[PDB]
Every structure is written in C-alpha cells, then in structure tokens.
CSV table of C-alpha atoms and ligand atoms in Angstrom, one decimal:
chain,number,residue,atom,x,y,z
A,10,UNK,CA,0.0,0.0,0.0
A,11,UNK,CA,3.0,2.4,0.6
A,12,UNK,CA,4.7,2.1,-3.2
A,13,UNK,CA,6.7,5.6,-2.0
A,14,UNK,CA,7.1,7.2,0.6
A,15,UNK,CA,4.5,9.8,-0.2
A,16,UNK,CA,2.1,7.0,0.1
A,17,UNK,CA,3.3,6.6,3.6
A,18,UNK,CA,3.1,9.9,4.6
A,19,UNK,CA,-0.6,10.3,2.9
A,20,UNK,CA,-1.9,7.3,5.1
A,21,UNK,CA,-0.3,8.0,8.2
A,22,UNK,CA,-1.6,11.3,7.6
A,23,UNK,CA,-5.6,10.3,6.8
A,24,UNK,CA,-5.3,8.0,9.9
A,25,UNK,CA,-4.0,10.4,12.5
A,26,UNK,CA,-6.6,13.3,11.3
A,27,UNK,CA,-9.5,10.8,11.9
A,28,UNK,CA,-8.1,9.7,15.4
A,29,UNK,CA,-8.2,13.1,16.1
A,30,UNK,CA,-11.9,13.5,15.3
A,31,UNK,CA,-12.8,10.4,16.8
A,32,UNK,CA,-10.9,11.5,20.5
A,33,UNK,CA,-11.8,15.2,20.0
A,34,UNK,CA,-15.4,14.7,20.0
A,35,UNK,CA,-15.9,13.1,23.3
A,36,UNK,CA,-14.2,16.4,25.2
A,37,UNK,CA,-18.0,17.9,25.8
A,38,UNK,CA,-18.7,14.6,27.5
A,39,UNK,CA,-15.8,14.4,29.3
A,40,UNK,CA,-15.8,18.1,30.8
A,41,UNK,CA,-19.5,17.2,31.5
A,42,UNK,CA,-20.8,19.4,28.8
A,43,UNK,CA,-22.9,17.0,27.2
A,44,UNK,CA,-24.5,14.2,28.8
A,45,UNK,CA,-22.6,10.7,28.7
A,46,UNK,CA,-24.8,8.2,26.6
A,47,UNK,CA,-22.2,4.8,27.9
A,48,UNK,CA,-23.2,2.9,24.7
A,49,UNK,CA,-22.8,5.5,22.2
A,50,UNK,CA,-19.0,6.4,24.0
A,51,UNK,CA,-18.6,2.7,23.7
A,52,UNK,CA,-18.8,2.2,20.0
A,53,UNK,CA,-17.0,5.6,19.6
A,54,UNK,CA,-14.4,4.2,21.0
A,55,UNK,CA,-14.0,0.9,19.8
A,56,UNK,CA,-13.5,2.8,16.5
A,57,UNK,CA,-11.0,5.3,18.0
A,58,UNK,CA,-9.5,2.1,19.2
A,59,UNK,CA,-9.1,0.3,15.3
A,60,UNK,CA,-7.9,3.5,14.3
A,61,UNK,CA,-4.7,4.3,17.1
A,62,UNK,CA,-3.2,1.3,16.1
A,63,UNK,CA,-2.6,2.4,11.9
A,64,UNK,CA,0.0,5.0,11.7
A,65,UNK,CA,2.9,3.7,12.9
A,66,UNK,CA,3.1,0.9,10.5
A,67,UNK,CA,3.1,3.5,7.6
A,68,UNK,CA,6.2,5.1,9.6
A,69,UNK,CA,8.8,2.1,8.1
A,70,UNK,CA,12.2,2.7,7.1
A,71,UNK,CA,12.6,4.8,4.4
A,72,UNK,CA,9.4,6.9,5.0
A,73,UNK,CA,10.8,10.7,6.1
A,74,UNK,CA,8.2,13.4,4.8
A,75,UNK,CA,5.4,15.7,6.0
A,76,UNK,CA,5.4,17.2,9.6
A,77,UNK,CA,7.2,13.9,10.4
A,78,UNK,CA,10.9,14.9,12.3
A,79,UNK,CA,13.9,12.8,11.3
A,80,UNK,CA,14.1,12.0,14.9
A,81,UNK,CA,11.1,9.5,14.3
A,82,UNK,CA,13.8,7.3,12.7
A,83,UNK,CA,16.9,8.4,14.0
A,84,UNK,CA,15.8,8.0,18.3
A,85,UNK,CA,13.5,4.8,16.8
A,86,UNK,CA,13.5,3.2,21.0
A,87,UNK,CA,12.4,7.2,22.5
A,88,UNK,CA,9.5,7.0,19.7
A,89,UNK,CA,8.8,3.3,20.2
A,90,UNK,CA,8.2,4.7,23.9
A,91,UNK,CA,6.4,7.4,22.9
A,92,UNK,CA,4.0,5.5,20.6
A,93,UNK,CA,3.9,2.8,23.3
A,94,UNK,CA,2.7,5.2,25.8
A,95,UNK,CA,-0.1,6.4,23.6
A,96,UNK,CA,-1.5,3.3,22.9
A,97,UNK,CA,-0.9,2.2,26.1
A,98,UNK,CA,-3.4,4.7,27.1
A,99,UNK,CA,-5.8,3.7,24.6
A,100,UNK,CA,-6.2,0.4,26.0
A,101,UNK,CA,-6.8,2.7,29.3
A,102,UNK,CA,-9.3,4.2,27.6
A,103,UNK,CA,-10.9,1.1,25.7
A,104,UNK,CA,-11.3,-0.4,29.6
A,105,UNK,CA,-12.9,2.9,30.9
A,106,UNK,CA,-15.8,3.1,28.5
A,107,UNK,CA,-16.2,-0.8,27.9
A,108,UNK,CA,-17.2,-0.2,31.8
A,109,UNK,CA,-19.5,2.5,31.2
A,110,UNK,CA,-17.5,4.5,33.8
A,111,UNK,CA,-17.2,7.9,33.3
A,112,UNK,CA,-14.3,9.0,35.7
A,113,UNK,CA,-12.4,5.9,34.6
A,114,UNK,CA,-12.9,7.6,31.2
A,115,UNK,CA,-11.8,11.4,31.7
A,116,UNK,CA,-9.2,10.2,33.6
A,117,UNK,CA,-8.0,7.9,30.5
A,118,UNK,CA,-9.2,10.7,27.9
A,119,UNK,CA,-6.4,12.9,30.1
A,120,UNK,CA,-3.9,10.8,29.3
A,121,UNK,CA,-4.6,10.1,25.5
A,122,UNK,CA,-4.6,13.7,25.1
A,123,UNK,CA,-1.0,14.1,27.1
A,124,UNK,CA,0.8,11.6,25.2
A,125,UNK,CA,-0.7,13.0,22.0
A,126,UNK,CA,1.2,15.7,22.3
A,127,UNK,CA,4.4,14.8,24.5
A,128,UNK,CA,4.9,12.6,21.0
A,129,UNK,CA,3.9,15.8,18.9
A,130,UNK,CA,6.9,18.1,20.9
A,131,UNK,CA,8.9,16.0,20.4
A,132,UNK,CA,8.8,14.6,16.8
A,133,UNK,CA,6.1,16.4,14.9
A,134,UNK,CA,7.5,19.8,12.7
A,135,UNK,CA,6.3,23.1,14.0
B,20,UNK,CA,-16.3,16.6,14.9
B,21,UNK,CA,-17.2,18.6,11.5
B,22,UNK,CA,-18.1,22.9,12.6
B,23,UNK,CA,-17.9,23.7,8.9
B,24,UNK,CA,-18.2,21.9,5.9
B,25,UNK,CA,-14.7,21.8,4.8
B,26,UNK,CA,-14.5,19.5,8.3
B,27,UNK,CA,-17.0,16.9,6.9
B,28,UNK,CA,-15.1,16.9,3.1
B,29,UNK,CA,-11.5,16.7,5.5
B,30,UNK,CA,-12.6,13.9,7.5
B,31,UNK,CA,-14.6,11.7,4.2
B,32,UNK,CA,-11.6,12.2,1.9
B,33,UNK,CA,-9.2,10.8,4.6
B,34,UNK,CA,-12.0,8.1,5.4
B,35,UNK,CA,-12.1,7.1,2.1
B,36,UNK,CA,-8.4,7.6,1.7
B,37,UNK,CA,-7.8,4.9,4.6
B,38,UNK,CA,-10.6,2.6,2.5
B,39,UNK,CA,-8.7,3.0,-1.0
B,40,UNK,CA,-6.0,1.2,1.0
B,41,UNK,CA,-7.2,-1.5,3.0
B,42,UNK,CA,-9.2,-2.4,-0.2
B,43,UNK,CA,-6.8,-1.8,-2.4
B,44,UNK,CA,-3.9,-4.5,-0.8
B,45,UNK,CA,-5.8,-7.1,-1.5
B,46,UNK,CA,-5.4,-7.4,-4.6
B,47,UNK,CA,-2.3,-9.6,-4.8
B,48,UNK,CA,-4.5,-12.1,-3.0
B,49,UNK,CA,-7.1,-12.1,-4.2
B,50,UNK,CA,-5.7,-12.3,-7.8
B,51,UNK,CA,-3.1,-15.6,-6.4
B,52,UNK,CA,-0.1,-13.4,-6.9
B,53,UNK,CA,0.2,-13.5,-3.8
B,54,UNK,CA,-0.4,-16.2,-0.8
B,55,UNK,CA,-3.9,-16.7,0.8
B,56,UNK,CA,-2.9,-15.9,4.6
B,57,UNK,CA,-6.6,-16.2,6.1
B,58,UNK,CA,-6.1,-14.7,9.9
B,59,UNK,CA,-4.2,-11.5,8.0
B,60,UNK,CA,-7.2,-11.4,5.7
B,61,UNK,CA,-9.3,-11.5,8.2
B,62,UNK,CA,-7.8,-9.2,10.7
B,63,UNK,CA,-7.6,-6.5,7.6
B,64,UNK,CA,-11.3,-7.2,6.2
B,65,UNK,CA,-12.3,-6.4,9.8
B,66,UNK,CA,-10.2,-2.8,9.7
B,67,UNK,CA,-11.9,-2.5,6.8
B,68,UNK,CA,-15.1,-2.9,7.6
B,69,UNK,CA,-15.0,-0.2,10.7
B,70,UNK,CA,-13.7,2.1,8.2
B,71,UNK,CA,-15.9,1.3,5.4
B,72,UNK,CA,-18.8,2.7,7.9
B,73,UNK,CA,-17.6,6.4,8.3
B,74,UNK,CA,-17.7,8.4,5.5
B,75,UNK,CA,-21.5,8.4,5.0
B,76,UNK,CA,-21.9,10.7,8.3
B,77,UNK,CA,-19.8,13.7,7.1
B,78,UNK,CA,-22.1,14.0,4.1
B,79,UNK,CA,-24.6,15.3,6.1
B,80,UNK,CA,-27.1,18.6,5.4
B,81,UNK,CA,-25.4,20.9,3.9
B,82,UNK,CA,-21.8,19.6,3.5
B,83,UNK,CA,-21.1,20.5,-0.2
B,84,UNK,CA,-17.9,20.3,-1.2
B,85,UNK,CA,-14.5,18.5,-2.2
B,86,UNK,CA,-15.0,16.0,-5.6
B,87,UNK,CA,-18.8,15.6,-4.1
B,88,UNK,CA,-21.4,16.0,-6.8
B,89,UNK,CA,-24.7,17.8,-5.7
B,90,UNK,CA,-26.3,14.9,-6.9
B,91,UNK,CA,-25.5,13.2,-3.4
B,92,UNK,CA,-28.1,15.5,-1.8
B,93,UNK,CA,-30.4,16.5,-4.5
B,94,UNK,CA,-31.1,12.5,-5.3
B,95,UNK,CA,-30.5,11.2,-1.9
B,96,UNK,CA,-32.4,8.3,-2.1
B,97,UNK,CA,-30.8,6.8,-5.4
B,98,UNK,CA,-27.2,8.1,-3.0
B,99,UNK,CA,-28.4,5.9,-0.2
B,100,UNK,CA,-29.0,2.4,-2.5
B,101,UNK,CA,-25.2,3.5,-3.8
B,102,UNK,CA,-24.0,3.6,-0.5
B,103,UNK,CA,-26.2,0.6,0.5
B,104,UNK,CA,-25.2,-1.8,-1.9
B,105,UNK,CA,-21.6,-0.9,-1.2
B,106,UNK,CA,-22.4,-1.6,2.7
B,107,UNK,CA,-23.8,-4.6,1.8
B,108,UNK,CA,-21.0,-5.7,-0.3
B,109,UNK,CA,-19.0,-4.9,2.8
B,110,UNK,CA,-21.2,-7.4,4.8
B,111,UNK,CA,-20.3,-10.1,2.3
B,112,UNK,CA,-16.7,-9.5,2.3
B,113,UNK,CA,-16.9,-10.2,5.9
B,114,UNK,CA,-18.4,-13.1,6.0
B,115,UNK,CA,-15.8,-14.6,3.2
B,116,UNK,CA,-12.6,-13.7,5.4
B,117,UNK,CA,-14.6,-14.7,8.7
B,118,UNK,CA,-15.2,-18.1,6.7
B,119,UNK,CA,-11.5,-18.3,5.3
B,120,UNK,CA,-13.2,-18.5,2.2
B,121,UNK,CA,-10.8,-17.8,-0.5
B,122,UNK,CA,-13.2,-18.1,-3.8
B,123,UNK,CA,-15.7,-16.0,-1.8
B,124,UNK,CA,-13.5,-13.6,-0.5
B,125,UNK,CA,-12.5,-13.4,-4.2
B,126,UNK,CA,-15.9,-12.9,-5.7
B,127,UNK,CA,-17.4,-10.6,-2.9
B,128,UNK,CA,-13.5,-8.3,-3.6
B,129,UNK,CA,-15.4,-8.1,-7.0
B,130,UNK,CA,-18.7,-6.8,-5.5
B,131,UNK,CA,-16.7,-4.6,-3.1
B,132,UNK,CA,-14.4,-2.8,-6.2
B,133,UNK,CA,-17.9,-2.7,-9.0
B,134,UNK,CA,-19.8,-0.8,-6.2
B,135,UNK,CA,-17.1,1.4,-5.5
B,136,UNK,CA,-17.2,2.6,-9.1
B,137,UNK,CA,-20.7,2.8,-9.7
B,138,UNK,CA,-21.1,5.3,-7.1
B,139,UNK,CA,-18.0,7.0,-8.3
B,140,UNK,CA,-19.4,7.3,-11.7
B,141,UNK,CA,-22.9,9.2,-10.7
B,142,UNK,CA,-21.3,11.1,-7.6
B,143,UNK,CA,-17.9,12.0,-7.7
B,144,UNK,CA,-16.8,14.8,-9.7
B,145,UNK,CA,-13.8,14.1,-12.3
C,3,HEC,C1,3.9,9.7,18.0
C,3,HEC,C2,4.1,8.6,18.8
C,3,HEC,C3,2.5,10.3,17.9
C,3,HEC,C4,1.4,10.1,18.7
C,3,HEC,C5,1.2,9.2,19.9
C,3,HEC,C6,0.3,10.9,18.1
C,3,HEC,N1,0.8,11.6,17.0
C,3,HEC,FE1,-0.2,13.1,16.0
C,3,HEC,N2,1.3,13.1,14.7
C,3,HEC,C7,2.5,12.5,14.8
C,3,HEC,C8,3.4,12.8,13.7
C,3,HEC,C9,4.9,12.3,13.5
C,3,HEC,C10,2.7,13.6,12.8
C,3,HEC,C11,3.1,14.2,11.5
C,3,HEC,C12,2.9,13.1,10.4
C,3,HEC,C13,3.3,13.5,9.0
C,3,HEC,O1,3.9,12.6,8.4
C,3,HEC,O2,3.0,14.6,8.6
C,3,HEC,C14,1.4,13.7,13.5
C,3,HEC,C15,0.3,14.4,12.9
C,3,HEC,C16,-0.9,14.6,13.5
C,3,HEC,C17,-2.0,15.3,12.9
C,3,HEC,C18,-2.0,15.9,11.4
C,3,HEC,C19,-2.5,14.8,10.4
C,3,HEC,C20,-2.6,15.5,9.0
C,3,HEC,O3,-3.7,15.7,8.5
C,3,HEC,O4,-1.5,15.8,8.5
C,3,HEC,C21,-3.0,15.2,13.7
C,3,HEC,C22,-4.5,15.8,13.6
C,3,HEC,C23,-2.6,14.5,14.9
C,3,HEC,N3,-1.3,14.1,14.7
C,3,HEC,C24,-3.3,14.3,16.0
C,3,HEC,C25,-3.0,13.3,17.0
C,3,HEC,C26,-3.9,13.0,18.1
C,3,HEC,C27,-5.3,13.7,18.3
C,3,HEC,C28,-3.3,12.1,18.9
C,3,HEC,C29,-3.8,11.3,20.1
C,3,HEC,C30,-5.1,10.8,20.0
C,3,HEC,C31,-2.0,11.8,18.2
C,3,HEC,N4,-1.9,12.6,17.1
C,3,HEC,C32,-1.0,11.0,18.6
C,3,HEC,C33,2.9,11.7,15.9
C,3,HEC,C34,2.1,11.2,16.9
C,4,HEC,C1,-20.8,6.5,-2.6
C,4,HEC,C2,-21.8,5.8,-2.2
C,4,HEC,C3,-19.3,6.0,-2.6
C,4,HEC,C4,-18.8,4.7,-2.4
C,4,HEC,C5,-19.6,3.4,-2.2
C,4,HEC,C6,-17.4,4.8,-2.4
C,4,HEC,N1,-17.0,6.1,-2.6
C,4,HEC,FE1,-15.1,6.7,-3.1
C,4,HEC,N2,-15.8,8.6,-3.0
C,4,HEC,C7,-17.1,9.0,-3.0
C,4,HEC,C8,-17.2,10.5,-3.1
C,4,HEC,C9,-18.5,11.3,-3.1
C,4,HEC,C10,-15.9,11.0,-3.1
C,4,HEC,C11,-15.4,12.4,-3.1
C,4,HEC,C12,-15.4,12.9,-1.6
C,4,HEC,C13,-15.1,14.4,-1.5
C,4,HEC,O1,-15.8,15.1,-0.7
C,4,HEC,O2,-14.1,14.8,-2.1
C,4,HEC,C14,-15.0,9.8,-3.0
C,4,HEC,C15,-13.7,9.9,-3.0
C,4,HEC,C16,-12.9,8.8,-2.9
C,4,HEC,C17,-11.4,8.8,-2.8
C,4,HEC,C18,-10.6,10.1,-2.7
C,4,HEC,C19,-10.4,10.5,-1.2
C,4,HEC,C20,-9.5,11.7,-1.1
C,4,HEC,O3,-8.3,11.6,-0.6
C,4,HEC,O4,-10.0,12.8,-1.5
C,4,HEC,C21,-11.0,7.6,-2.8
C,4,HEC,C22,-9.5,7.1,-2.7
C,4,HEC,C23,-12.1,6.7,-2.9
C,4,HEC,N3,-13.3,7.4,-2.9
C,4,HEC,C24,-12.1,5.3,-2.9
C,4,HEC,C25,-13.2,4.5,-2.7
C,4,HEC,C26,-13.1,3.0,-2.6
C,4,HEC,C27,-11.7,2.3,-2.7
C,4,HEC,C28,-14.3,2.5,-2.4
C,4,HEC,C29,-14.7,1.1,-2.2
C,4,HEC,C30,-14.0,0.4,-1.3
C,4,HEC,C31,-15.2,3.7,-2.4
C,4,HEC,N4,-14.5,4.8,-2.6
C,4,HEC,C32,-16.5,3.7,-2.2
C,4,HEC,C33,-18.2,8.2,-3.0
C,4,HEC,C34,-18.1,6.8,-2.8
C-alpha cells in the first residue's frame, strides 16, 4: 500500500486526522458538557481504538516526509516509547468506556490527550 | 467533529483515503499473486469494515464540497442504494474472510471494487 514514501506519509496522515476526530469529539462529554450516553461512548471508542493502532506501521524505514521529524527514525527506541505510551493509554481508555465509567474515562481521555502531544513536541515539525 | 463543511469533506476524503487502501492491498491475493494468509485477511477485512462505515456521516445537510457532486443531496435516495449496496458488499466481504473463504472472499472483492465505481461514476466529480 506504501509504493513511496508519499504513500506513507498520505496514510499516516488520513489516519492520524481521523483519530483526532474520533478523541476530540468526546471532550464535551468528558468536561461534563454533554451528557454521557455509555453505549454510544462505547462504539466511539472501539473505533478510536481500530484506528490508534494504523499509523505507525506506515512510519517504516525509508518513510521521512510531512510534519514527520527525522528524529522518528533516528531515536526509533524514544518514539517506540512514545508511541507505546499512547496506545498504552488507549487500551486505558478502551477499559474505561467498555465499563460505562465515566471518571475511569476522563481520567483515561487525560492521558490520550498528554501523550498526543508529548509525542507531537517531540517529533512532529512546527 | 465537523463545525464547517470543509471539516465533513476533510474527515470523508481521509476516510475514504484509509478505504482505498485497506481495499486496495488485497489485490495480490485475491488475484493468487500472492499467498492466501486467512487470519491477516481476516484481521484486515475487519479494519476494513470499521472504516468502510464512516464516511457516510460527514455527508450530512449541507456539506457540499471537495470532488462531491450535488447529486448526493439532491437525489439522496438513489445516493443511499449506492451507498447501501456498497455496505452490503461490505457485509459479504466479511463473512468470506470470517469463513476463510478464499473463492468467496475473491468474488465478494469483485462486488466490493464494482460498487465502488458505480457510485463514483454518478457522484464524484472528475
Ligand atoms: C507519536 C508517537 C504520535 C502520537 C502518539 C500521536 N501523534 Fe499526531 N502526529 C505524529 C506525527 C509524526 C505527525 C506528522 C505526520 C506526518 O507525516 O505529517 C502527526 C500528525 C498529526 C495530525 C495531522 C495529520 C494531518 O492531517 O497531516 C493530527 C491531527 C494528529 N497528529 C493528532 C493526534 C492525536 C489527536 C493524537 C492522540 C489521540 C496523536 N496525534 C498521537 C505523531 C504522533
Ligand atoms: C458513494 C456511495 C461511494 C462509495 C460506495 C465509495 N465512494 Fe469513493 N468517493 C465518493 C465520493 C462522493 C468521493 C469524493 C469525496 C469528496 O468530498 O471529495 C469519493 C472519494 C474517494 C477517494 C478520494 C479521497 C481523497 O483523498 O480525497 C478515494 C481514494 C475513494 N473514494 C475510494 C473508494 C473506494 C476504494 C471505495 C470502495 C472500497 C469507495 N471509494 C466507495 C463516494 C463513494
């Protein structure tokens, strides 16, 4: 599916915007801005779930470009941590609403969102 | 998830970006170029079916926009049997990898990839 690296970097691209829908949306449920329907959360994330796991599979060798930093490839074990972290937390946050427990789940959500970004400061391009 | 329109376009196109390619590398297989491996398959048909499921929300009331041809909103009903049929097809590839059903997989690939087109053809702008 990746004939170049542009390919790559389109997926991993496409993938990462539509996690980003799919965990963004819940933040007026987890603030307590919109009532928390535990079904609905559940399928939501089940999807956001299916989804966290592409990208990193269309970050292979040879595959620099985007908003990708080098760094992705030349600190590979700090990003393997980094990516492990995340979905790590996504299993946190898979448990949380598979419960239908809604502390469990902002306090999972919190940490999707940290290592979101603790990955994005250190290997994303300003 | 989708404030303006351009959101809804942004999140379909990478949707169906994500689709193209799960489809898309099966082909070898499907074709024999390549070996039958039915737990892959099957793990893959399965990604693709959660994605195969998402676009169809982000072209919602008044999302106009991208390569979408107005057609998709002022003939919504012949839209819905295009995007049916292609569900549908979906459903069948599903229950060939499930099997580990190579001929089936094979001939419900065929459905998939036909109904892919034929809503291309009458609602996606060249
Ligand atoms: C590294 C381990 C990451 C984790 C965890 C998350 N993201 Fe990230 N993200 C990462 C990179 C290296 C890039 C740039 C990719 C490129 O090749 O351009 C990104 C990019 C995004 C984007 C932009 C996608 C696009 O349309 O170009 C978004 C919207 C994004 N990331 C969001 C996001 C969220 C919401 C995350 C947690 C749920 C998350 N990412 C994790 C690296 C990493
Ligand atoms: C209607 C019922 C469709 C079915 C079934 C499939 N697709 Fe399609 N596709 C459709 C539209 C209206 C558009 C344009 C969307 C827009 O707003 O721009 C598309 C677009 C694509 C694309 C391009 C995505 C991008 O990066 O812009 C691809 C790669 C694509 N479609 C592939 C595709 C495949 C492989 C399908 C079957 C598995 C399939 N689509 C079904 C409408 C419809």
């Amino acid at each position: 599916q990746f004939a170049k690296p542009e390919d790559a970097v389109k997926y991993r691209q496409s993938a990462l915007t539509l996690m980003a829908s799919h965990f963004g949306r819940m933040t007026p449920v987890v603030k307590g801005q919109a009532p928390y329907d535990a079904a609905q959360i559940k399928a939501n994330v089940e999807v956001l779930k299916t989804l966290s796991a592409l990208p990193w599979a269309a970050f292979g060798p040879g595959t620099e470009g985007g908003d990708a930093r080098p760094e992705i490839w030349s600190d590979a074990a700090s990003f393997k941590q980094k990516q492990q972290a995340f979905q790590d937390n996504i299993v946190k946050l898979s448990a949380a609403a598979d419960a239908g427990d809604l502390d469990k789940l902002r306090a999972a959500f919190g940490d999707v969102g940290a290592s979101c970004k603790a990955c994005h400061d250190a290997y994303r391009k300003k």
